[PDB]
Structure 1
Amino acid sequence: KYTGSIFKRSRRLGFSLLENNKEFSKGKKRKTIPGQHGNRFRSSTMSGYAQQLQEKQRMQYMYGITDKQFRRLFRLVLKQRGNLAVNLFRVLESRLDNIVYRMGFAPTRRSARQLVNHGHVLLNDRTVDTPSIILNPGDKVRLKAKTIKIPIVKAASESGVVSPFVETNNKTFEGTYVRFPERSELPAGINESYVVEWYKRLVK
């Protein structure tokens, strides 16, 4: 369950999946809002609601998340101790298929989600099929063995390009993760904290 026009959505929001693969393309290098009414005036002065909605949509499309799941996670995180601007970021980044992407065994986040749903991924001491499990740094998320021989495993095992917050112990595909991602590892695609306030208003 996801959109099939990630190019269109990236062109609208202006922010791709941090690689600009859906912006560079092989044609026209288009960086405009889609549709016929893309090259018009009235660019800035987006309302507060408009910019909050745009940022929230970018955040919840960067990971393939349904808004109801977003409300659920926010209601989960909100009650604890206090200012959790360091906790809810870990909460949002701890997705299993997201961790598979930052592991580097799939070309794209939703392709990793498809593999997770199809059951080519294991866990610390169990197996996981649902691509929404909340993880905690310390679990040995070891990859499957019968999926290392599939005709599409090359770019999967080419994980030498990896994020520093996912440690694989290369050539062993152990793929654990410690040293939670910082705002540096969460790039400028969405780096704002009043989406938190928007969900505070629209969710008690």
Structure 2
Amino acid sequence: MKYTGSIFKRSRRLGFSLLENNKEFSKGKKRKTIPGQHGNRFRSSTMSGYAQQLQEKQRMQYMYGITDKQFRRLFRLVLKQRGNLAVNLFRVLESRLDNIVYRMGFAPTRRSARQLVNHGHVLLNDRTVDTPSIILNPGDKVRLKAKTIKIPIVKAASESGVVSPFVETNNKTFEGTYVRFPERSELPAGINESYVVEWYKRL
């Protein structure tokens, strides 16, 4: 869902952070224990391998904030082109419009990246976009539509935002460019692509 509500509850259930320790900031307490009446000293009573594949898939798609309809659309579109699509799937998921906005340091979270995109604060190729389902390509210029440059939050975020080697950005003019495709190693390895790929029983 585009708005998961209290996502920290999922964090306690899943134990899958977002930057380093901002998902388990010990607000209340830093725990990986499962919430609910089902047990806080012992785990659940139903377990399967399909369950852990789903656990990995949900962890990754909540770190990315993917909706199921959009997820299937992206899967179908990835099936279009050829090559070693296992890692290309992860690369294009990281190439999402909100994903790239986050990688540029323009948004503290994807939750906020979608808020930035939808409100007219994102402008690509001189064509206003409110749909973050855009796959960035090497050498694509991303701007902020400086009408919204006055915001103190974005000014503070741009100077000390996330910077990745596979893109470039300027911390003071809020302008960046996607330069090259990323690599799997620099990205978190807590999820397995093959789990989701073999998990695809819809088609």
TM-score interval, smaller chain:
0.7 to 0.9
Distance 1:3 1:132, change over 3 A: same
Instruction: Report the number of matched residues.
Output: 202
In the TM superposition, 1:28-177 aligns within 5 A as: 28-41=29-42, 46-159=47-160, 161-177=162-178
Q: Is the 8 A contact 1:106 1:155 kept in 2?
A: no
- Please say which of residues 123-132 and 10-19 is displaced more in the overlay: 123-132
Q: Is the 8 A contact 2:104 2:169 kept in 1?
A: yes
Shift of 1:44: 10
Q: Is the 8 A contact 1:183 1:191 kept in 2?
A: no
Q: Is the 8 A contact 1:96 1:133 kept in 2?
A: yes
Q: Is the 8 A contact 1:74 1:199 kept in 2?
A: no
- Please say which of residues 148-157 and 58-67 is displaced more in the overlay: 148-157
CA deviations on 1:126-162 (whole Å, 9 max, x unpaired) are 2211122222122111222121112323323224541
Q: Which runs of 5+ in 1 are unaligned?
A: none
Shift of 1:119: 0.6
Distance 1:134 1:161, change over 3 A: closer
CA deviations on 1:141-186 (whole Å, 9 max, x unpaired) are 1222121112323323224541222210443332111222211232
- Please say which of residues 105-114 and 179-188 is displaced more in the overlay: 179-188
Q: Is the 8 A contact 2:18 2:63 kept in 1?
A: yes
Q: Is the 8 A contact 2:102 2:110 kept in 1?
A: yes
- Please say which of residues 38-47 and 93-102 is displaced more in the overlay: 38-47
Shift of 1:82: 4.3
Q: Distance in 2 between matches of 1:92 and 1:63?
A: 8
CA deviations on 1:17-75 (whole Å, 9 max, x unpaired) are 13221212333222211113343445799412111111111122111111121111111
Shift of 1:8: 0.3
Structural RMSD (CA): 2.3
Distance 1:42 1:106, change over 3 A: closer
Shift of 1:188: 2.6
Instruction: With the length of structure 1 as denominator, give the TM-score of the two structures.
Output: 0.87
- Please say which of residues 177-186 and 102-111 is displaced more in the overlay: 177-186
The residue matched to 1:152 in structure 2 has which SS? helix
Q: Is the 8 A contact 2:139 2:180 kept in 1?
A: no
- Please say which of residues 170-179 and 1-10 is displaced more in the overlay: 170-179
Q: Distance in 2 between matches of 1:102 and 1:30?
A: 27
Q: Distance in 2 between matches of 1:42 and 1:158?
A: 43
Q: More strand per residue: 1 or 2? A: 2
Q: Which runs of 5+ in 2 are unaligned?
A: none
Cross-structure match for 2:196: 195
Q: Is the 8 A contact 1:10 1:23 kept in 2?
A: yes
Shift of 1:111: 0.9
Q: Is the 8 A contact 1:105 1:155 kept in 2?
A: no
Q: Distance in 2 between matches of 1:81 and 1:133?
A: 19
Distance 1:59 1:28, change over 3 A: closer
Distance 1:28 1:170, change over 3 A: closer
Q: Distance in 1 between matches of 2:94 and 2:9?
A: 24
Percent identity, please.
100
Q: Distance in 2 between matches of 1:10 and 1:30?
A: 9
Q: Distance in 2 between matches of 1:4 and 1:194?
A: 26
- Please say which of residues 141-150 and 163-172 is displaced more in the overlay: 163-172
Q: Is the 8 A contact 2:87 2:193 kept in 1?
A: no
Shift of 1:201: 5.6
